[PDB]
Amino acid sequence: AVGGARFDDGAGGDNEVQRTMLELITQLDGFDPRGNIKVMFATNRPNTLDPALLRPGRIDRKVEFSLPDLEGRANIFRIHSKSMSVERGIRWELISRLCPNSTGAELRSVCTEAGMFAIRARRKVATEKDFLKAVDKVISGYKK
Amino acid sequence: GTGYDLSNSVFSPDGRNFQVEYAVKAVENGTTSIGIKCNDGVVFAVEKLITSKLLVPQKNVKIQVVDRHIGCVYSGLIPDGRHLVNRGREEAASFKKLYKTPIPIPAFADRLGQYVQAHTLYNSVRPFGVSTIFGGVDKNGAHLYMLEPSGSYWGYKGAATGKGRQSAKAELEKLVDHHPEGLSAREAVKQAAKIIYLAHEDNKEKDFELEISWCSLSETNGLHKFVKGDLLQEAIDFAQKEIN
Amino acid sequence: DINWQELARSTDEFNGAQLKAVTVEAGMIALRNGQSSVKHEDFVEGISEVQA
Amino acid sequence: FRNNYDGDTVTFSPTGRLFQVEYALEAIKQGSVTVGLRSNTHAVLVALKRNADELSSYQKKIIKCDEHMGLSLAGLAPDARVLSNYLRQQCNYSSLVFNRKLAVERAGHLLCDKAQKNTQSYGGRPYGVGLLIIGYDKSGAHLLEFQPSGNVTELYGTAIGARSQGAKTYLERTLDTFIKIDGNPDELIKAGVEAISQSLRDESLTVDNLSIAIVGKDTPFTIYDGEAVAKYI
Amino acid sequence: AGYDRHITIFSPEGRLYQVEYAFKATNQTNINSLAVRGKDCTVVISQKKVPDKLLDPTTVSYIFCISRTIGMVVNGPIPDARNAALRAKAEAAEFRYKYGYDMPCDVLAKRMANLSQIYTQRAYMRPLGVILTFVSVDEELGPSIYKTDPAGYYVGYKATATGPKQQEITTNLENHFKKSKIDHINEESWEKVVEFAITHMIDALGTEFSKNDLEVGVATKDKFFTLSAENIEERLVAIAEQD
Amino acid sequence: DRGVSTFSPEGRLFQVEYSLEAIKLGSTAIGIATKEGVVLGVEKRATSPLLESDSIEKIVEIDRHIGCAMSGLTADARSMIEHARTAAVTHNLYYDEDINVESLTQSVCDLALRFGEGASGEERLMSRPFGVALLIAGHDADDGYQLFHAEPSGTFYRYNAKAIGSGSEGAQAELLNEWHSSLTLKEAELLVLKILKQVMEEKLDENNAQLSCITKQDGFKIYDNEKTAELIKELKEKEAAE
Amino acid sequence: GYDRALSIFSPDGHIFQVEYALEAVKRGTCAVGVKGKNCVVLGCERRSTLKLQDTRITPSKVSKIDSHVVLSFSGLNADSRILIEKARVEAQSHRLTLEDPVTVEYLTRYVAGVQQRYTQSGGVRPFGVSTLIAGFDPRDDEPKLYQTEPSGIYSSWSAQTIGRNSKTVREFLEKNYDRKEPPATVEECVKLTVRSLLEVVQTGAKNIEITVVKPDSDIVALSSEEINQYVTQIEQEKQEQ
Predict the structure, then answer these.
(1) Interface partners of F (3+ CB pairs, < 8 Å)?
(2) Which family does it belong to (chain A)?
(3) Does F125 touch chain G (CB under 8 A)?
(4) Do F199 and A97 touch (CB under 8 A)?
(5) Residues of C in contact with A61 (CB under 8 A)
(6) Exposed e or buried b for every residue in D110-138, given b needs 16+ CB within 10 A?
(7) D218 alpha carbon, distance to own chain's centre
(8) CATH number, domain containing residue G212
(9) How far apart (Å, rounded) are the C-alpha atoms in residues D43 and G139?
(10) Domains in chain G: how many in total?
(11) Concatenated DSSP letters for C1-52?
(12) Which domains does chain E have, with CATH numbers?
């Protein structure tokens, strides 16, 4: 959002944006005690970084968010489920079996989509196929 | 436009095949190697790059023979040359089969380049990554040529391919002027070893072995054979002193 | 435990910090090896975190 | 860019390079590790048999093309199988035609330009496997290495696939030891066993994972796996 | 699409750029050369350029003796040079073999002319970037000059030059021929014809030539041939005598 | 676009990897090599009621001693199958005996690369690799029973048990769990049968799945819907106890 | 000469061409087939895009491969004709070779590879045609109905349609047919067919074209009136309520 490394400072208003990036980098470099305070940057792209960013002593470790997996979805599901009234005879393991690996956010399209299936199936505890259909439905209807 | 570079057979707007030029990239990329047309004969010399202990010395031998009178050496893809070597090794017996005579170096030459030239003629027919120093004593005296993936070779009183050529180019051109007379193969043998080390100095960084061969109407008696043993060691010691 | 050349040969063609990537991993991996001491294994595990 | 220069084995880099080769070259180290060495007496192969699962079997990296000649692989097996079969013909062929054993030397000659054709010929591709090849012959035990670049070499010893350097360094380190281990396959072998241990990283060599072969003077090309590797484990 | 330049296909204009670029490769060797039909003879002169010592300079020619009767000069790369002569070499004996008498010069030209037009029309076939001039003293046509292009286009010449500076000698001879008004150099000794040429080559090229400077050849009755550096020198000497 | 034989920077073949894509698409196909036999089970995956699940065959006999299954685009196998069937007979025709399933296996694997357009080093004519990977069951005297995953890679292994197709992975873990040396065929049956029904989208019946074994005595033997439905219900009993 | 592989696993592992072949099939005017207990009935729509055709010499959609073997399809009328031939050829071969005409499967399985060829065959595209195969095996009365597709895949059907809106009529038939109760009578099957046709054909008689195979090379294509009989017959059953 702040932009990474870019030539876009040539526009002349993005300098401030960079200046803010400059500010941060300038600031963050020296005086952040990084033994205690943790410096972490969430992003879509690891490459976009202002070269100053990834520099050693500034960004040492560089990590990808590990995509929620067959297991992760299950538990990420399971939590998504707990707000819903959901069947516990079924497993979010069972659902995440069906699902490919997708973002920990979308795993509600698995789960919270069946709050309707809860009341569509009129299972206050939404069943396996409730969320299976959700995995069906949302991914079926997905087509993007 | 561009892409002229990409397909072999293409004439770029300049009328040029950049692949061939890119082949030349691989060519010069070759290990420095030289050849010397001497008085009776020609002499072939190439640095053998030693990459490790596990290398069994003297086994891997870059210079290959065609017939027994045609020695050949090339800088570029070792498979390329060998591929063409056999390709040559064909034609001689082939020629020799029809003509009963082992093939003249020049005769033997043009064969190759045409074949090589084929490797120009189609965008897919990736030319060879090698230029090749080659020749030997034939019906009349020695001959020494060095052939380009272009399909260009010529008569060369000495020739060098690989990286360190320029170290050699002088060195040869020297002995050209040092010996516009001519040279005994054995002195060419001696001279080359120097020149190679000198040529090697372009590549000097790593250990290397030295393959040298030759076709001496005198010594090989119109044949191509390898510089070997003591005269080899001689030329080395000769060279390895003269390198100092 | 460190042997650079092993690292240095097992690592290949690092712009320096990739060695340090290996190394900071190694230090990291040293505590991940429980050591405050940072060893060849730390560094080979600095290698082990994929050096490509 | 490269997709310009890489895509076609017929097409040099601007630097005059074939990335497909380099790519095939990549699949090399991608391949499982395996090791080989020779004495003047014997020539030994040591392989890491990788499986898919434990449920699966363990991919064998070693091939017998001949009594005096058998090889090991890293990278794509299917290529070699052909080549091996192709090669198997040759020793056969020679010993068929000439009653002559194919020179491990002369063997290496073959696949090279054979590979070279994979290279220079558009529409096709190189083979996806480099080869370690032990052979014994009238010239003795010969360990040769091949490159999908076409390039072949006789080594006193070597290893390939993944991280072979550890063994390799150690082997190159070990050099004069095994080559002088003579009439002692075992320590020729156990050198490799140690060698492969050097480039052993993930785990130790096992009955299933360790594969071993030796050709030698009176040792025909002979493969050792499992219980055969068990004692050397 | 834009491949139309990469390949031989009618440009939007119906044009063939590779061809047009093959034309580039023609003088890409940068050798200027001439073909002059003497009275008796036909004579061809060209630049022998010896950039290197390491060369065997003797080996360097773009003038090629096609047949008994027919030679040819090449303007273009020696690989492509060495090719067409070979190609030409076949047809002669071939023609002769087939036809019992030697191939007339232009026939080869017309023949070789056919060739590129193929590659011209044959996309994967690339045409060759050499310009070729065939000459002989034809049993029928006597002295003969036939130049062909990378395009398979060709014609007879009262005489011609070819090279980067072709136009200059072209003018020169055109000047001299519009002057002389006869298709051929009228001289019985090809020597003179040569000497005439080397003059008018030296003339229009404004360029004095050593004997190592010149690729020199003479098409004579029943025999095309060339000269050593010494006949060249003889000319150099002889031509130094007229001037 | 790009050549199919074009190596990945990895030294891999995109198409292969893409061939690997269609592989997972296949009905999840599972097999277990017991010393009793080799159990096989697969997903019929009937895509429409009017479709009669009968005409669905992802499991095929090559020979009594050799029969196998397919998961992937079932088209490519046809040749391969008959091709496989060929050599066996052919071997037998020459060798008066049964081929090593492995040898056959290995042989059939060799089909893999035989796609190409004017490839360098031999003429291999197909537009593309094979859209199916195959579970290979067999009994051979030498090796007893034999189980193999035939793969468009041309690489394969002998699987103590193997699952391929859609949900094979967890099933594989299941197999990995479920498998032991001492497995009885009927165990592995219900094992797969459950694991299928487990991994099966559709609730396993006889019509939405298929079963077979290969047995040193009987060789390759496909299970009817009935004994299927029998063992099916048998699961439901055994599956629901605790 | 032209080897160029037109069918390639795409990154997804798919051949769009294969996938597009179906599109022409979808584009292909609908065609249905259904088996009575004794019989198979093939309904097909005529592409109604034009007229002034002489319908006689206008080619019918369903085609006989063998006296007991006919086929319907959806896609390029071109692709069929070839397929039609080789099939027709095949049976005659099978006839001559096997001293017996094909089973319908075998023929089907035969034609299966044909498409399946061009799939893994370079230099070609597969057919734009999925087919329906109707015939009763020699010495077999049993209705045999085989759907096929340019992917080279095929199966048995209690009933099947293909072409544009095939699902529509299929969805119709999927309920409108019972496995346990085939519309055993030809008519009821044909009528059920015609029912399923008007689903898609959208009220036409000429445009509907029926084919029915009975045992032992017993096969019939109905006149539009015979069709319209059922057409009209069905209409009442509708308009009754």
Answers:
(1) A, D, G
(2) Belongs to the AAA ATPase family.
(3) yes
(4) yes
(5) 24, 28
(6) bbbbbbbbbbbbbbbbbbbbbbbbbbbbe
(7) 21
(8) 3.60.20.10
(9) 68
(10) 1
(11) ---HHHHHHHS-S--HHHHHHHHHHHHHHHHHTT-SS--HHHHHHHHHTT--
(12) 2-242 (3.60.20.10)
Which residue of A lies nearest to F202 if distances are taken between CA atoms? A129
* C-alpha–C-alpha distance, residues D222 and D135, integer Å: 10
d(CA G82, CA E168): 67
Task: Using an 8 Å CB-CB cutoff, list chain A residues near F170.
Answer: 70, 97
Phi/psi-derived region of residue G6, left when phi > 0, alpha when psi is between -120 and 50, beta in every other case? alpha
* G146, G73 contact by CB (below 8 A): no
Instruction: Give the technique used to solve this structure.
Output: cryo-EM
Burial call E49-84: b when 16+ CB within 10 Å, e when fewer: beeeebbbbeebbbbbbbbbbbbbbbbbbbbbbbbb
Q: Is D117's CB within 8 Å of F121's CB?
A: yes
Cα–Cα distance for residue pair E158/E175, rounded to 1 Å: 13
Structure token pair of residue E126:
């690339």
C-alpha distance from A101 to closest chain C C-alpha (Å)? 22
D72: phi then psi, degrees, rounded to nearest 5? -130, 165
Report which residue type is found at E162: T
* DSSP assigned state of E22: H
- Tell me whether residues A70 and F170 touch, CB distance under 8 A: yes
The answer, for B127 touching chain E at a CB cutoff of 8 Å, is no
* Number of domains composing chain F: 1
B10 closest CB neighbour out of E6, E28, E125: E6
Residue C2 contacts A where some CB pair is shorter than 8 Å: no
Instruction: Give me the number of domains chain B comprises.
Output: 1
Class of domain D3-233: alpha beta
Q: Give per-residue burial for E120-135: e unless 16+ CB within 10 Å, then b.
A: beeeebbbbbbbbbbb
Strand pairing category for F132-140 and D42-48: unpaired
Q: Are E95 and E107 in contact (CB under 8 A)?
A: yes
Resolution in A: 4.8
Nearest by Cα to A4 from A58, A57, A31, A41: A41
Q: In which domain, by residue range, is B186 found?
A: 2-244
Angle at G148 between CA G142 and CA G154, to 5 degrees: 70
Q: Could you report how far apart the first and last alpha carbons of chain F are, in Å?
A: 56
Whether B117 and E124 lie within 8 Å, measured CB to CB: no
Contact E35, E160 (CB under 8 A): yes
C-alpha span between B225 and B232 (Å, rounded) = 12
Burial environment of residue G86 by CB neighbours within 10 A (0 to 12, 13 to 18, 19 or more): middle
Domain residues for F142?
A: 1-242
Within 10 Å of residue B181's Cβ, how many Cβ atoms?
7
Q: Which helix (H) or strand (E) holds E144?
A: strand E142-148
The whole-angstrom distance between residue G15's C-alpha and the CA centroid of its chain comes to 24
CA C42 to chain A, closest CA, distance in angstroms equals: 15
Separation between Cα atoms, residue F120 and residue D126, nearest integer Å: 8
Give the residue among F40, F42, F64 at the shortest CA–CA distance from F53. Answer: F42
Segment holding B80, helix H or strand E? helix B78-99
Strands (E), E12-139: 33-37, 42-47, 63-64, 71-75, 131-138
Q: How far is CA D65 from CA D32, D35, D103, D134, F8, in A?
A: 20, 17, 12, 10, 29
Write out the DSSP string of G142-190: S--EEEEETTTEEEEBSEEEESTTHHHHHHHHHHHS-SSS---SHHHHH
What CATH number does residue F83 fall under? 3.60.20.10
Interface check B182 vs D, CB under 8 A: no
Indicate yes or no: CB of F19 within 8 angstroms of CB of G7.
no
Closest CA to A124 of A88, A87, A99, A93: A87
Q: Position of tokens 């690891």?
A: A46
A35 touching C, CB under 8 A? no
What's the domain range around G223? 1-240
Task: Name all chains with 3 or more CB-CB pairs below 8 Å to chain C.
Answer: A, D
